[PDB]
Design a protein around this ligand. Sequence first.
Ligand SMILES: *C(=O)[C@@H]([C@@H]1NC(C(=O)O)=C(S[C@@H]2CN[C@H](C(=O)N(C)C)C2)[C@@H]1C)[C@@H](C)O
Length: 246
Amino acid sequence: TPSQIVQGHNQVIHQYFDEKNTSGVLVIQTDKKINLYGNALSRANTEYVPASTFKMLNALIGLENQKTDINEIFKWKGEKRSFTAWEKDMTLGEAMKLSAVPVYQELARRIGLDLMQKEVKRIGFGNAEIGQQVDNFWLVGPLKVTPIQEVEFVSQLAHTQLPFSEKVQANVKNMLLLEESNGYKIFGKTGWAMDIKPQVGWLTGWVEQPDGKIVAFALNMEMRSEMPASIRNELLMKSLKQLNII
Ligand SMILES: *C(=O)[C@@H]([C@@H]1NC(C(=O)O)=C(S[C@@H]2CN[C@H](C(=O)N(C)C)C2)[C@@H]1C)[C@@H](C)O
């Protein structure tokens, strides 16, 4: 009789990251319990630049402090942008889904260095340090955050427990809906810091199950320039299915 290799979700999600030849962690939180999966669990308590995941908090601060509103159309004023898809007028929510950093640079500048630093420290996001450059502090340092801190943050958003008004949290949640099917909803925000070394990739968000239960996640992995951006979505969705969260 031969032996059988028996592999549960822990081994499988470790091997999903090995197959991409990169280092990654998936942090899960539900019912105030956090579990770690992937091939690089020490990443879960390591600080990384948040990159575009910071747009969730930029939006909360800008809406709370009435620097913008959910219907405002941010105009494309004519500079060549990183992607043609960004060369259009769009709302905060559209810019969230596209990760359109020039819209959120305009918003960060309206908020201003002083209010932004005070608000980031009030929330206590990551190392709460934004330095002197108001338009890139989430992209190239000095702001850094761990994957565990991101899962705690996004779980609070999902539960309307951040220290912001309930309407502002509801409105930002609505900007983050990625998919709905069969009574499940997936909400989340991607990020990819391409301008530092090592590059960092994120996908932070939560699943709302058909009975209303919230399962939050933070995927964090080392990226390289030849990977498709969808590698993050692929690894997340395969892992969530292995975990029977979807
Ligand atoms: C934020 O982290 C950066 C941007 N965020 C992402 C991302 O995480 O997906 C990208 S790539 C972006 C995704 N949607 C566009 C697309 O796929 N096409 C138009 C083809 C591009 C950026 C690196 C950064 C800009 O701050």
